């Protein structure tokens, strides 16, 4: 899925689009290798599925590399997901997959 990802002023897909289409992750966010199966659904349900299983580590990694704010979000606590996910190109792939 990388070799068919770039082509011509280029336009590239972030891997998050492919994860949105259904392909299951491997080692994101400092978790254990090979935790996710492909039976994770595709789209919003699949995204929620693979996020909720990691959310605590998902936020402690964010707080462990700089990303911190004084806003107790009900989901991610104090880490500022709004800046990092934009940085890590998560929103970009997630909204480019839908086009």
């Amino acid at each position: 899925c990388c070799a068919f990802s770039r082509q011509r002023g280029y336009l590239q897909y972030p891997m998050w689009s492919f994860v949105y289409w259904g392909l299951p992750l491997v080692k994101v966010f400092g978790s254990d290798p090979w935790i996710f199966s492909w039976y994770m659904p595709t789209g919003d349900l699949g995204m929620y599925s693979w996020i909720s299983l990691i959310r605590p580590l998902m936020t402690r990694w964010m707080v462990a590399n700089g990303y911190v704010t004084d806003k107790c979000s009900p989901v991610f606590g104090n880490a500022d997901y709004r800046k990092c996910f934009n940085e890590l190109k998560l929103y970009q792939g997630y909204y480019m997959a839908q086009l």
């Binding site: 936020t59 402690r60 107790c72 989901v75 606590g77 104090n78």
Partner: peptide, 18 residues
Amino acid sequence: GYQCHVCSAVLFSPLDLD
């Protein structure tokens, strides 16, 4: 590091966590 259990927010000392 000490983490909450209601919103997963992470702190750095038990009194802060409490």
